[PDB]
Amino acid sequence: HAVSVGKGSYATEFPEIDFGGINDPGFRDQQGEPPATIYRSDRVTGPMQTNSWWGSLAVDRFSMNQYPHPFSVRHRAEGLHVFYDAPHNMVVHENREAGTWHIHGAIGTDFTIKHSGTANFEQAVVDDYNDWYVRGLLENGAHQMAITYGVGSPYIFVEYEDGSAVLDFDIAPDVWEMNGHVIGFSTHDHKHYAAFAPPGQNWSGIGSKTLTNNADYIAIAKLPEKDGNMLAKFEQYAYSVVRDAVADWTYDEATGTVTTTFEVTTEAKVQGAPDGTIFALYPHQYRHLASSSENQLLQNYQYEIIRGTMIGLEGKRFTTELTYPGVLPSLPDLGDYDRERLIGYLHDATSDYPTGSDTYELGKYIGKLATLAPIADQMGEYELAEQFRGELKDILEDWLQATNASGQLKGKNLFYYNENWGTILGYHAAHSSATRINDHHFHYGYFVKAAAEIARADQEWAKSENWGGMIDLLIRDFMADRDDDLFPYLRMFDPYSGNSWADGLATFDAGNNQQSSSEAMHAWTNVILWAEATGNKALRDRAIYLYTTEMSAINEYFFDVHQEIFPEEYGPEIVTINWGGKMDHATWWNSGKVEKYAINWLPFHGGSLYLGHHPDYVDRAYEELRRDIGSTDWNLWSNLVWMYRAFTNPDDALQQMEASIDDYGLFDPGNEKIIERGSTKAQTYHWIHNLAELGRVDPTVTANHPIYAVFNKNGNRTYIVYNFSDSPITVQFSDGHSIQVEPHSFNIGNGD
């Protein structure tokens, strides 16, 4: 009933849960498993993909509404509904009393793609998928309709078995170009589309509500404009059905460059169809397009979507280039703090305890301890640092064992492998981490943080045959490489959308969602640190790719740093929750004003410096939150606002901190006014004083090793490197600066 992995183990049978006398139905229902039924064909075997834009197809009998941008679609018994949010469909609404804003479209139908033989399909299943397309299969015995579609595809490819094509409309469309087998058409409300069949298979029903074609293959395209030259271009790739799609990446450690090539492989549905497609690129992609891909752009081919403007690009592949900025295990000892006051705060933190038994609340607590230990080391409090790391070891050694002293499965504080889907679930569970396969990056990221801090001081503990095997198992659950026998590829991450999706099932009409982009970045940071500490280059580089790509998405869709994506009428300077089909300034729980910003900042750690790359954004967002609050009397989590403010104005952050940090004493679960419960006074005090001495984050300088940061105060740069090696190293920076770093240390600010 359990599998040994080094000194640890995971359960292979669902445990008999220890509820601890808690009768609350919500809590009890969390200690379960994901759905027994997976709507996939017998062509889809092995660990099932989750946390995808398309997941509702796998979980629901049919599907819920999905956003393969530029389209929205949904599977039904009658066929596939297709929709496009035009400007008249989009709204921006504010609820002043709730403090919420919503940018959204409609759940309409422009037309339904149908099968001539049936409008009563039994189910829709996942029949194939790749890095960002899916093949959905509507099934009714001999009648089948296979639909291939994806984020960043302006095509929907339709393949029929035992029937032919039908497009059904509630109001008759305007067919403005009739080329026989190819038609350009518009909905009654002027949305422009095209349909393509093989030569000789001509469309019928023009002028009526129902367009028909005898072919066993059609493609639908969303056209950027009512334009026959564009229709002719779409015709060129309309018979090249996407079968494979991969996002392959490299990390150039010398330059920091992360290069990602998106490549499709198509199957020809007519003689001579080219191996390629027309991609629709998101802002985070085209703003970083490689020079070599520029010639493939279709300049005037634009689509408006929730995420701004998509642009067309033709061919087999395209490439993006990003800059990995480094991460640190902790900020070093460079602040102008009262060392005795900080030491006092470090000892105060021994009063802290987890506010629940689930993986998330336990996670927040071990993240807190892992953050305190390096600061204790810096202050010369080696014995206190050892207490914290000893507490981390005791917790991890408990959770990473599935069996008790007798050899039977435990009822809590363990991990279990669900074989049906192929995922590691932790009990106790919360936020539907087990029942919906939610948030595995958010939760397990904190476990990796604890492991990485242990590994920084104790390489032996972190060896695979000891406790490292189980940590590497948790990491595989949420970010596996290809051909992993237990887990699907990069579970959390959508390589094309550029962000992680938090919900395992995606059974919402807005598609999938992500709230805390900062907890995702925290997970990626901790894997970089863990992998560096344990000598695992392939793992480290994968986490670098994730960190850097997620950052590009965050700056577009959560922050809109370029002031191009959010509608002008949208008041806030942040989107709290990104969905496939909408954007919310709102939280998953009932909160106040600060939390709707700070849930995309927390936790603060050595990988948080990405938050300060755009100082005008940091100012703009802070100022808007301050305007809405009406003062610096933060409704909750004051310390997070101060730490954020320190990215651009550490003097202001310092005066706010001095005025209120000691308003309350030791850890109090009921009161997060001043200190958010995953944070501490020691962390807050250490952070703000470091930023005061260091100045602004400087993203214009890179290094030829991955564990570093560069700051800039009025033209004077500070270069920080941590060296995880047993040997000394030399680090070259891109501005010509060079430093030596001794084993297991920072170059500067090691402390006592």
Ligand X SMILES: OC[C@H]1O[C@@H](O[C@@H]2[C@@H](O)[C@H](O[C@@H]3[C@@H](O)[C@H](O[C@@H]4[C@@H](O)[C@H](O)O[C@H](CO)[C@H]4O)O[C@H](CO)[C@H]3O)O[C@H](CO)[C@H]2O)[C@H](O)[C@@H](O)[C@@H]1O
Ligand Y SMILES: OC[C@H]1O[C@@H](O[C@@H]2[C@@H](O)[C@H](O)O[C@H](CO)[C@H]2O)[C@H](O)[C@@H](O)[C@@H]1O
Ligand Z SMILES: *[C@@H]1O[C@H](CO)[C@@H](O)[C@H](O)[C@H]1O
Pick the closer one to ligand Y by CB: 444 or 622.
444
**Beta carbon of residue 474, minimum distance to ligand X (angstroms, whole number):** 28
Question: Please, what's the b/e burial string for 723-732 (b: 16 or more CB within 10 A of its CB; e: otherwise)?
Answer: bbeeeebebe
Q: Which of 174, 167, 160, 153 is nearest to 195 (CA)?
A: 167
Tell me if 515 contacts ligand Y by CB under 6 A. yes
Q: Which residues pair with 139 in a beta bridge?
A: 123, 144
Place of tokens 């390489």: 459
- How many Å apart are CA 466 and CA 457, to the nearest integer? 15
Please give the full DSSP string across 23-37, using - where no structure is assigned.
Answer: --HHHHHHSS-S-S-
Q: Given candidates 381, 439, 541, 584, which one binds ligand Y under the rule CB under 6 A?
A: 439
**Beta carbon of residue 368, minimum distance to ligand Y (angstroms, whole number):** 11
Tell me if 442 contacts ligand Y by CB under 6 A. yes
Binding partner of 439, given ligand X, ligand Y, ligand Z, none, CB within 5-8 angstroms per partner class:
ligand Y
Binding mask 592-611 for ligand Y (x = CB under 6 A): ----------x---------
| φ, ψ (nearest 5 deg) of residue 448 | -70, -35
The residue whose Cβ lies closest to ligand Z is 589
Residues making contact with ligand X (CB under 6 A)? 64, 98, 100, 508-510, 577, 584, 586-590
| Residue 639 per-residue DSSP state | H
CA distances from 481 to 81, 400, 493, 656 (A): 34, 22, 12, 45
Tell me if 361 contacts ligand Z by CB under 6 A. no
Tell me if 353 contacts ligand Y by CB under 6 A. no
- Binding residues for ligand Z, rule CB under 6 A, total 2
**Beta carbon of residue 653, minimum distance to ligand Z (angstroms, whole number):** 23
Sign of CA dihedral 624, 629, 633, 636: negative
Tell me if 588 contacts ligand Y by CB under 6 A. yes
Pick the closer one to ligand Y by CB: 109 or 517.
517
Binding partner of 586, given ligand X, ligand Y, ligand Z, none, CB within 5-8 angstroms per partner class:
ligand X
Q: Given candidates 589, 630, 631, 716, which one binds ligand Z under the rule CB under 6 A?
A: 589
Place of tokens 């049936």: 118
Binding partner of 508, given ligand X, ligand Y, ligand Z, none, CB within 5-8 angstroms per partner class:
ligand X
Q: Which of 267, 279, 154, 275 is nearest to 217 (CA)?
A: 267
Tell me if 573 contacts ligand Z by CB under 6 A. no
Binding partner of 509, given ligand X, ligand Z, ligand Y, none, CB within 5-8 angstroms per partner class:
ligand X
Burial classification of residue 618, based on how many CB atoms lie within 10 Å of its CB (0-12 exposed, 13-18 middle, 19 or more buried): buried
- How many Å apart are CA 298 and CA 108, to the nearest integer? 29
Proportion of the chain in helix, strand, coil states, percent, rounded to 5 = 30, 25, 45
Place of tokens 């099968």: 115
Tell me if 358 contacts ligand Y by CB under 6 A. no
> Do strands 155-161 and 165-168 pair parallel, antiparallel, or not at all (unpaired)?
unpaired
Amino acid at 424: I
From 42-50, 182-190, 490-498, 512-520, give the range in contact with ligand Y by CB under 6 A: 512-520
Q: Given candidates 85, 477, 672, 698, which one binds ligand Z under the rule CB under 6 A?
A: 672
**Beta carbon of residue 591, minimum distance to ligand X (angstroms, whole number):** 6
Tell me if 26 contacts ligand Y by CB under 6 A. no
Report yes or no: 375 and 682 within 8 Å, Cβ to Cβ: yes
Pick the closer one to ligand X by CB: 15 or 105.
105
Q: Which of residues 656-695 bind ligand Y (CB under 6 A)?
A: 678
Q: Which residues pair with 414 in a beta bridge?
A: 427
Binding site for ligand Y (CB under 6 A): 360, 364, 431, 438-439, 442-443, 515-516, 519, 588-589, 602, 678
Binding site for ligand Z (CB under 6 A): 589, 672
